[PDB]
Amino acid sequence: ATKEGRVQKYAKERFEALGGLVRKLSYEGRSGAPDLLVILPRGVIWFVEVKKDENTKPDPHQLREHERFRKRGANVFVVGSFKQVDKLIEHYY
Amino acid sequence: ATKEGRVQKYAKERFEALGGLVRKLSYEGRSGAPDLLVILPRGVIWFVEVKKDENTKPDPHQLREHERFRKRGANVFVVGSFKQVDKLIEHYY
């Protein structure tokens, strides 16, 4: 697809293999929502932003939105390659 | 505003008074997302659907989506009056 699209599809497949529900998120009347909402068993909720490669940072409005979430304790992760998806699961799940 | 709009605004204000971040949610290319994502301190995540009155049930696609979330342990609540917002906070927070 697109590079970003391929990483997103892999992530979706890995999370669904763990029993997770994956949704593509957007906000009504606001930008900056994380690309994926991931609902994993036992009430684990992850918000995952997907980028095209490991050197691509999220844009400024995205970064401020991730920090608003994390200040309150929410799980927000950024991945930009298949390896990063694999490390996220290994280390955080 | 609309009845549903007034309850939604009250809910937003009550959650923001607890330190919460409130967002109006939508999905890309899918319907049925809960009306509100609420991120409360200490990583508490609530999805809240708001209706115009206490007798209005969510539509069928919404109900199936709430159950997909709750099967995995997520917090999904439906409120349709100011009193229900108040009871939700009293009982669940």
Residue numbers in the entry:
A (entry chain A), B (entry chain A): 2 to 94
Text of the article:
However, we were able to solve the first VRR-Nuc domain structures using single-domain proteins derived from three bacteria and bacteriophage as surrogates: Psychrobacter (psNUC); Streptococcus equi bacteriophage P9 (stNUC); and Salmonella enteritidis typing phage 3 (saNUC). Crystal structures of three representatives show that they structurally resemble Holliday junction resolvases (HJRs), are dimeric in solution, and are able to cleave symmetric four-way junctions. DALI searches show that the structures with greatest similarity to the VRR-Nuc domains are all Holliday-junction-resolving enzymes exemplified by Hjc. As dimers, bacterial VRR-Nuc domains have two active sites and a DNA-binding surface with 2-fold symmetry that are well suited to the recognition and symmetrical, bilateral cleavage of Holliday junctions.
